[PDB]
Design a protein around this ligand. Structure first.
Ligand SMILES: *C(=O)CNOCCCCC
Length: 67
């Protein structure tokens, strides 16, 4: 019933923590996707899928939220 634009989903999670200093932004993928995910945006503007349940991921989010 709703948006007919594509939206990004994640089908795998990066296995090891990204360097924190290379990440500038994050977002969660749509709740419509089959998997929950954090996407980190790097300073080279790459987008990397990550597991929201991982400690390092939650730590990075808190840090990013902690401007
Ligand atoms: C709202 O329009 C929902 N529609 O679902 C159709 C099933 C696949 C949509 C891509």
């Amino acid at each position: 019933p709703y948006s007919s634009d594509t939206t990004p989903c994640c089908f795998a999670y990066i296995a090891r923590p990204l360097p924190r200093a290379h990440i500038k932004e994050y977002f969660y993928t749509s709740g419509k996707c089959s998997n929950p995910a954090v996407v980190f945006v790097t300073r080279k503007n790459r987008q990397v899928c990550a597991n929201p349940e991982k400690k390092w991921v939650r730590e990075y989010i808190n840090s990013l939220e902690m401007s």
